[PDB]
mmCIF file of all heavy atoms in Angstrom:
data_model
loop_
_atom_site.group_PDB
_atom_site.id
_atom_site.type_symbol
_atom_site.label_atom_id
_atom_site.label_comp_id
_atom_site.label_asym_id
_atom_site.label_seq_id
_atom_site.Cartn_x
_atom_site.Cartn_y
_atom_site.Cartn_z
ATOM 1 N N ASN A 1 -10.232 -10.813 -9.971
ATOM 2 C CA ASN A 1 -11.059 -10.486 -8.904
ATOM 3 C C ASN A 1 -10.409 -9.791 -7.753
ATOM 4 O O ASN A 1 -10.228 -10.337 -6.690
ATOM 5 C CB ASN A 1 -11.742 -11.749 -8.366
ATOM 6 C CG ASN A 1 -12.699 -12.366 -9.326
ATOM 7 O OD1 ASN A 1 -13.854 -11.888 -9.421
ATOM 8 N ND2 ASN A 1 -12.300 -13.398 -9.976
ATOM 9 N N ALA A 2 -10.128 -8.504 -7.970
ATOM 10 C CA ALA A 2 -9.487 -7.713 -6.911
ATOM 11 C C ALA A 2 -10.606 -7.383 -5.930
ATOM 12 O O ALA A 2 -11.767 -7.287 -6.350
ATOM 13 C CB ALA A 2 -8.811 -6.503 -7.459
ATOM 14 N N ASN A 3 -10.276 -7.064 -4.723
ATOM 15 C CA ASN A 3 -11.224 -6.698 -3.681
ATOM 16 C C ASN A 3 -11.693 -5.327 -3.881
ATOM 17 O O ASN A 3 -10.900 -4.364 -3.702
ATOM 18 C CB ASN A 3 -10.567 -6.884 -2.299
ATOM 19 C CG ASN A 3 -11.502 -6.598 -1.172
ATOM 20 O OD1 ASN A 3 -12.469 -5.853 -1.306
ATOM 21 N ND2 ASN A 3 -11.195 -7.222 -0.103
ATOM 22 N N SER A 4 -12.915 -5.109 -4.228
ATOM 23 C CA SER A 4 -13.481 -3.858 -4.574
ATOM 24 C C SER A 4 -13.492 -2.804 -3.467
ATOM 25 O O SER A 4 -13.451 -1.604 -3.660
ATOM 26 C CB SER A 4 -14.912 -4.046 -5.023
ATOM 27 O OG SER A 4 -15.674 -4.460 -3.936
ATOM 28 N N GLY A 5 -13.344 -3.323 -2.225
ATOM 29 C CA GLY A 5 -13.388 -2.485 -1.060
ATOM 30 C C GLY A 5 -11.952 -1.950 -0.772
ATOM 31 O O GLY A 5 -11.785 -1.122 0.168
ATOM 32 N N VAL A 6 -11.041 -2.410 -1.577
ATOM 33 C CA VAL A 6 -9.654 -1.987 -1.401
ATOM 34 C C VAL A 6 -9.298 -1.140 -2.653
ATOM 35 O O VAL A 6 -8.720 -0.095 -2.504
ATOM 36 C CB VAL A 6 -8.750 -3.209 -1.274
ATOM 37 C CG1 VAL A 6 -7.292 -2.753 -1.230
ATOM 38 C CG2 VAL A 6 -9.189 -3.965 -0.074
ATOM 39 N N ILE A 7 -9.863 -1.587 -3.839
ATOM 40 C CA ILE A 7 -9.574 -0.799 -5.022
ATOM 41 C C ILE A 7 -10.172 0.585 -4.947
ATOM 42 O O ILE A 7 -9.593 1.507 -5.452
ATOM 43 C CB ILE A 7 -10.251 -1.487 -6.253
ATOM 44 C CG1 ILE A 7 -9.571 -2.891 -6.576
ATOM 45 C CG2 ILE A 7 -10.265 -0.592 -7.540
ATOM 46 C CD1 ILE A 7 -8.103 -2.780 -7.153
ATOM 47 N N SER A 8 -11.311 0.683 -4.336
ATOM 48 C CA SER A 8 -11.986 1.966 -4.137
ATOM 49 C C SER A 8 -11.267 2.939 -3.145
ATOM 50 O O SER A 8 -11.660 4.124 -3.065
ATOM 51 C CB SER A 8 -13.360 1.774 -3.656
ATOM 52 O OG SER A 8 -13.387 1.274 -2.338
ATOM 53 N N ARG A 9 -10.292 2.487 -2.405
ATOM 54 C CA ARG A 9 -9.603 3.298 -1.457
ATOM 55 C C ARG A 9 -8.969 4.469 -2.142
ATOM 56 O O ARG A 9 -8.315 4.299 -3.234
ATOM 57 C CB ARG A 9 -8.673 2.565 -0.598
ATOM 58 C CG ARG A 9 -9.247 1.639 0.286
ATOM 59 C CD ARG A 9 -8.232 0.755 1.001
ATOM 60 N NE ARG A 9 -7.369 1.478 1.919
ATOM 61 C CZ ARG A 9 -7.608 1.810 3.169
ATOM 62 N NH1 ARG A 9 -8.732 1.441 3.715
ATOM 63 N NH2 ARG A 9 -6.664 2.470 3.850
ATOM 64 N N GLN A 10 -8.898 5.575 -1.475
ATOM 65 C CA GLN A 10 -8.335 6.827 -2.064
ATOM 66 C C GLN A 10 -6.901 6.654 -2.477
ATOM 67 O O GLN A 10 -6.514 7.261 -3.504
ATOM 68 C CB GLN A 10 -8.372 7.947 -1.016
ATOM 69 C CG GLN A 10 -7.947 9.260 -1.571
ATOM 70 C CD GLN A 10 -8.844 9.788 -2.670
ATOM 71 O OE1 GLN A 10 -10.083 9.455 -2.682
ATOM 72 N NE2 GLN A 10 -8.282 10.591 -3.567
ATOM 73 N N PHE A 11 -6.132 5.841 -1.832
ATOM 74 C CA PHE A 11 -4.809 5.648 -2.248
ATOM 75 C C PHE A 11 -4.757 5.266 -3.726
ATOM 76 O O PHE A 11 -3.867 5.653 -4.470
ATOM 77 C CB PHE A 11 -4.095 4.553 -1.461
ATOM 78 C CG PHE A 11 -2.781 4.382 -1.828
ATOM 79 C CD1 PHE A 11 -1.783 5.159 -1.490
ATOM 80 C CD2 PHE A 11 -2.458 3.264 -2.736
ATOM 81 C CE1 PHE A 11 -0.530 4.947 -1.864
ATOM 82 C CE2 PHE A 11 -1.243 3.069 -3.094
ATOM 83 C CZ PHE A 11 -0.215 3.924 -2.732
ATOM 84 N N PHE A 12 -5.645 4.298 -4.141
ATOM 85 C CA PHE A 12 -5.663 3.812 -5.444
ATOM 86 C C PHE A 12 -6.309 4.830 -6.409
ATOM 87 O O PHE A 12 -5.867 5.039 -7.504
ATOM 88 C CB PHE A 12 -6.310 2.504 -5.474
ATOM 89 C CG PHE A 12 -5.562 1.494 -4.796
ATOM 90 C CD1 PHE A 12 -6.016 1.108 -3.592
ATOM 91 C CD2 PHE A 12 -4.355 1.071 -5.234
ATOM 92 C CE1 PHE A 12 -5.308 0.155 -2.900
ATOM 93 C CE2 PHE A 12 -3.682 0.167 -4.479
ATOM 94 C CZ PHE A 12 -4.087 -0.272 -3.236
ATOM 95 N N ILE A 13 -7.205 5.629 -5.868
ATOM 96 C CA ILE A 13 -7.827 6.641 -6.697
ATOM 97 C C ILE A 13 -6.855 7.605 -7.233
ATOM 98 O O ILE A 13 -6.785 7.963 -8.386
ATOM 99 C CB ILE A 13 -8.986 7.396 -5.956
ATOM 100 C CG1 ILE A 13 -10.066 6.444 -5.442
ATOM 101 C CG2 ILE A 13 -9.464 8.532 -6.722
ATOM 102 C CD1 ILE A 13 -10.838 5.698 -6.448
ATOM 103 N N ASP A 14 -5.820 7.900 -6.382
ATOM 104 C CA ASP A 14 -4.764 8.866 -6.766
ATOM 105 C C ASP A 14 -3.538 8.099 -7.408
ATOM 106 O O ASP A 14 -2.535 8.774 -7.625
ATOM 107 C CB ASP A 14 -4.307 9.566 -5.497
ATOM 108 C CG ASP A 14 -5.311 10.690 -5.057
ATOM 109 O OD1 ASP A 14 -5.882 11.312 -5.869
ATOM 110 O OD2 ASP A 14 -5.515 10.797 -3.841
ATOM 111 N N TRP A 15 -3.645 6.879 -7.629
ATOM 112 C CA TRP A 15 -2.590 6.111 -8.236
ATOM 113 C C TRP A 15 -2.029 6.668 -9.498
ATOM 114 O O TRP A 15 -0.864 6.821 -9.632
ATOM 115 C CB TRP A 15 -3.043 4.663 -8.538
ATOM 116 C CG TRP A 15 -2.025 3.833 -8.934
ATOM 117 C CD1 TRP A 15 -1.830 3.350 -10.154
ATOM 118 C CD2 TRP A 15 -1.024 3.215 -8.157
ATOM 119 N NE1 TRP A 15 -0.864 2.455 -10.225
ATOM 120 C CE2 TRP A 15 -0.260 2.410 -9.006
ATOM 121 C CE3 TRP A 15 -0.725 3.316 -6.853
ATOM 122 C CZ2 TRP A 15 0.737 1.730 -8.511
ATOM 123 C CZ3 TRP A 15 0.387 2.589 -6.402
ATOM 124 C CH2 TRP A 15 1.081 1.818 -7.245
ATOM 125 N N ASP A 16 -2.936 7.149 -10.353
ATOM 126 C CA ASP A 16 -2.532 7.623 -11.605
ATOM 127 C C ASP A 16 -2.049 8.996 -11.702
ATOM 128 O O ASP A 16 -1.661 9.534 -12.683
ATOM 129 C CB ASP A 16 -3.606 7.369 -12.639
ATOM 130 C CG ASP A 16 -3.756 5.845 -12.951
ATOM 131 O OD1 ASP A 16 -2.719 5.214 -13.293
ATOM 132 O OD2 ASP A 16 -4.833 5.385 -12.844
ATOM 133 N N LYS A 17 -2.130 9.714 -10.549
ATOM 134 C CA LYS A 17 -1.612 11.074 -10.508
ATOM 135 C C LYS A 17 -0.384 11.199 -9.691
ATOM 136 O O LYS A 17 0.548 11.914 -10.037
ATOM 137 C CB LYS A 17 -2.658 12.019 -9.960
ATOM 138 C CG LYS A 17 -3.927 12.119 -10.769
ATOM 139 C CD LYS A 17 -3.690 12.682 -12.153
ATOM 140 C CE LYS A 17 -4.978 13.011 -12.910
ATOM 141 N NZ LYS A 17 -4.648 13.511 -14.283
ATOM 142 N N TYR A 18 -0.361 10.463 -8.550
ATOM 143 C CA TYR A 18 0.799 10.549 -7.681
ATOM 144 C C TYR A 18 1.438 9.251 -7.212
ATOM 145 O O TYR A 18 2.647 9.088 -7.208
ATOM 146 C CB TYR A 18 0.366 11.386 -6.515
ATOM 147 C CG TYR A 18 -0.334 12.555 -6.888
ATOM 148 C CD1 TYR A 18 -1.656 12.660 -6.577
ATOM 149 C CD2 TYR A 18 0.257 13.660 -7.500
ATOM 150 C CE1 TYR A 18 -2.375 13.760 -6.812
ATOM 151 C CE2 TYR A 18 -0.430 14.736 -7.719
ATOM 152 C CZ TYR A 18 -1.808 14.797 -7.387
ATOM 153 O OH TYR A 18 -2.507 15.918 -7.633
ATOM 154 N N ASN A 19 0.602 8.359 -6.781
ATOM 155 C CA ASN A 19 1.022 7.262 -5.962
ATOM 156 C C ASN A 19 1.847 6.189 -6.698
ATOM 157 O O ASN A 19 2.627 5.521 -6.113
ATOM 158 C CB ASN A 19 -0.064 6.685 -5.165
ATOM 159 C CG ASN A 19 -0.487 7.690 -4.111
ATOM 160 O OD1 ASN A 19 0.255 8.534 -3.745
ATOM 161 N ND2 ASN A 19 -1.764 7.654 -3.713
ATOM 162 N N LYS A 20 1.590 6.066 -8.025
ATOM 163 C CA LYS A 20 2.340 5.047 -8.825
ATOM 164 C C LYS A 20 3.743 5.233 -9.043
ATOM 165 O O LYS A 20 4.405 4.345 -9.558
ATOM 166 C CB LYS A 20 1.612 4.882 -10.160
ATOM 167 C CG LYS A 20 1.846 6.037 -11.134
ATOM 168 C CD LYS A 20 0.851 5.957 -12.208
ATOM 169 C CE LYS A 20 1.053 4.871 -13.273
ATOM 170 N NZ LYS A 20 0.103 5.099 -14.407
ATOM 171 N N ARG A 21 4.315 6.414 -8.674
ATOM 172 C CA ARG A 21 5.742 6.681 -8.890
ATOM 173 C C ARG A 21 6.414 7.222 -7.674
ATOM 174 O O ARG A 21 5.809 8.045 -6.954
ATOM 175 C CB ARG A 21 5.976 7.624 -10.084
ATOM 176 C CG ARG A 21 5.613 7.057 -11.413
ATOM 177 C CD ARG A 21 5.269 8.119 -12.365
ATOM 178 N NE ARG A 21 6.367 8.938 -12.673
ATOM 179 C CZ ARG A 21 6.336 10.095 -13.417
ATOM 180 N NH1 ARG A 21 5.219 10.409 -13.958
ATOM 181 N NH2 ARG A 21 7.419 10.720 -13.664
ATOM 182 N N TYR A 22 7.648 6.836 -7.449
ATOM 183 C CA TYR A 22 8.332 7.404 -6.310
ATOM 184 C C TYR A 22 8.534 8.798 -6.424
ATOM 185 O O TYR A 22 8.420 9.602 -5.397
ATOM 186 C CB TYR A 22 9.656 6.714 -6.042
ATOM 187 C CG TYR A 22 10.388 7.374 -4.924
ATOM 188 C CD1 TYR A 22 10.057 7.169 -3.559
ATOM 189 C CD2 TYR A 22 11.474 8.245 -5.174
ATOM 190 C CE1 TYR A 22 10.681 7.811 -2.542
ATOM 191 C CE2 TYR A 22 12.080 8.882 -4.131
ATOM 192 C CZ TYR A 22 11.686 8.608 -2.837
ATOM 193 O OH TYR A 22 12.372 9.307 -1.814
ATOM 194 N N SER A 23 8.873 9.356 -7.591
ATOM 195 C CA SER A 23 9.126 10.741 -7.662
ATOM 196 C C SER A 23 8.001 11.632 -7.422
ATOM 197 O O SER A 23 8.049 12.651 -6.779
ATOM 198 C CB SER A 23 9.688 10.976 -9.078
ATOM 199 O OG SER A 23 8.667 10.685 -10.029
ATOM 200 N N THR A 24 6.834 11.152 -7.867
ATOM 201 C CA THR A 24 5.663 11.960 -7.639
ATOM 202 C C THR A 24 5.103 11.686 -6.273
ATOM 203 O O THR A 24 4.520 12.642 -5.602
ATOM 204 C CB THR A 24 4.597 11.701 -8.731
ATOM 205 O OG1 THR A 24 4.303 10.342 -8.791
ATOM 206 C CG2 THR A 24 5.215 12.159 -10.062
ATOM 207 N N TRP A 25 5.249 10.521 -5.714
ATOM 208 C CA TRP A 25 4.832 10.234 -4.456
ATOM 209 C C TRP A 25 5.540 11.144 -3.470
ATOM 210 O O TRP A 25 4.965 11.757 -2.596
ATOM 211 C CB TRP A 25 5.050 8.787 -4.065
ATOM 212 C CG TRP A 25 4.692 8.529 -2.695
ATOM 213 C CD1 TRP A 25 3.485 8.161 -2.318
ATOM 214 C CD2 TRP A 25 5.530 8.441 -1.574
ATOM 215 N NE1 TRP A 25 3.441 7.946 -0.987
ATOM 216 C CE2 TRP A 25 4.727 8.161 -0.503
ATOM 217 C CE3 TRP A 25 6.884 8.669 -1.383
ATOM 218 C CZ2 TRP A 25 5.216 7.968 0.754
ATOM 219 C CZ3 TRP A 25 7.362 8.587 -0.156
ATOM 220 C CH2 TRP A 25 6.601 8.246 0.915
ATOM 221 N N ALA A 26 6.891 11.147 -3.664
ATOM 222 C CA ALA A 26 7.743 11.957 -2.718
ATOM 223 C C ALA A 26 7.415 13.399 -2.776
ATOM 224 O O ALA A 26 7.363 14.084 -1.839
ATOM 225 C CB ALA A 26 9.178 11.708 -3.053
ATOM 226 N N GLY A 27 7.133 13.832 -4.076
ATOM 227 C CA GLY A 27 6.776 15.251 -4.226
ATOM 228 C C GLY A 27 5.551 15.615 -3.478
ATOM 229 O O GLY A 27 5.519 16.565 -2.732
ATOM 230 N N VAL A 28 4.510 14.773 -3.597
ATOM 231 C CA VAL A 28 3.268 15.038 -2.951
ATOM 232 C C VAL A 28 3.434 14.976 -1.425
ATOM 233 O O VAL A 28 2.969 15.775 -0.721
ATOM 234 C CB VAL A 28 2.157 14.131 -3.307
ATOM 235 C CG1 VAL A 28 0.945 14.333 -2.369
ATOM 236 C CG2 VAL A 28 1.770 14.386 -4.643
ATOM 237 N N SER A 29 4.159 13.921 -0.999
ATOM 238 C CA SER A 29 4.273 13.800 0.409
ATOM 239 C C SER A 29 4.943 15.009 0.997
ATOM 240 O O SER A 29 4.546 15.492 2.011
ATOM 241 C CB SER A 29 5.006 12.545 0.788
ATOM 242 O OG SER A 29 4.285 11.388 0.443
ATOM 243 N N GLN A 30 5.940 15.602 0.305
ATOM 244 C CA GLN A 30 6.429 16.812 0.838
ATOM 245 C C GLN A 30 5.431 17.977 0.726
ATOM 246 O O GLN A 30 5.224 18.708 1.666
ATOM 247 C CB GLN A 30 7.780 17.178 0.184
ATOM 248 C CG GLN A 30 8.893 16.268 0.576
ATOM 249 C CD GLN A 30 10.196 16.576 -0.064
ATOM 250 O OE1 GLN A 30 10.246 17.149 -1.061
ATOM 251 N NE2 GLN A 30 11.244 16.195 0.669
ATOM 252 N N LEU A 31 4.687 18.029 -0.373
ATOM 253 C CA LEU A 31 3.790 19.078 -0.637
ATOM 254 C C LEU A 31 2.713 19.173 0.483
ATOM 255 O O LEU A 31 2.286 20.272 0.878
ATOM 256 C CB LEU A 31 3.023 18.844 -1.978
ATOM 257 C CG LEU A 31 1.974 19.777 -2.357
ATOM 258 C CD1 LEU A 31 2.469 21.176 -2.483
ATOM 259 C CD2 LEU A 31 1.428 19.299 -3.696
ATOM 260 N N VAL A 32 2.288 18.052 1.018
ATOM 261 C CA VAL A 32 1.286 18.082 2.025
ATOM 262 C C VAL A 32 1.852 17.922 3.419
ATOM 263 O O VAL A 32 1.075 17.822 4.390
ATOM 264 C CB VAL A 32 0.256 16.953 1.780
ATOM 265 C CG1 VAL A 32 -0.383 17.143 0.405
ATOM 266 C CG2 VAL A 32 0.890 15.622 1.888
#
């Protein structure tokens, strides 16, 4: 029972593309 109002947040939406890893997180953070 995760909180659906938290799971839906954009951070998690992007989890599988960028946010789940340091290397990709860091890459994006510099990119933007």
Side-chain angles (χ1 to χ4, degrees):
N1 295 281
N3 184 334
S4 66
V6 178
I7 293 292
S8 70
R9 292 172 64 87
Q10 185 63 29
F11 179 79
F12 293 108
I13 297 301
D14 287 320
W15 186 252
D16 289 310
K17 297 296 187 183
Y18 310 112
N19 292 336
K20 72 198 284 188
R21 291 156 66 185
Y22 176 74
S23 62
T24 56
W25 177 86
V28 173
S29 292
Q30 290 179 334
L31 179 59
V32 301

